[PDB]
Amino acid sequence: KVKVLGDVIEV
Protein backbone atom coordinates (compact mmCIF):
# COMPACT_ATOMS: atom_id res chain seq x y z
CA LYS A 1 0.00 0.00 0.00
CA VAL A 2 1.15 3.58 -0.66
CA LYS A 3 0.58 6.15 2.06
CA VAL A 4 1.73 9.72 2.46
CA LEU A 5 3.94 10.47 5.47
CA GLY A 6 4.76 14.15 5.95
CA ASP A 7 5.76 17.04 8.20
CA VAL A 8 4.50 20.48 9.07
CA ILE A 9 7.03 23.06 7.93
CA GLU A 10 7.38 26.77 8.59
CA VAL A 11 7.50 28.62 5.30
Binding footprint of a second copy on the chain (CB under 8 A): 1-11
Cα 2 to Cα 7: distance, rounded to the nearest angstrom: 17
Cα 8 to Cα 11: distance, rounded to the nearest angstrom: 9
How long a stretch of residues is the chain?
Answer: 11
Nearest distance in Å: CB 10, a second copy: 6
Nearest distance in Å: CB 4, a second copy: 4
Nearest distance in Å: CB 5, a second copy: 5
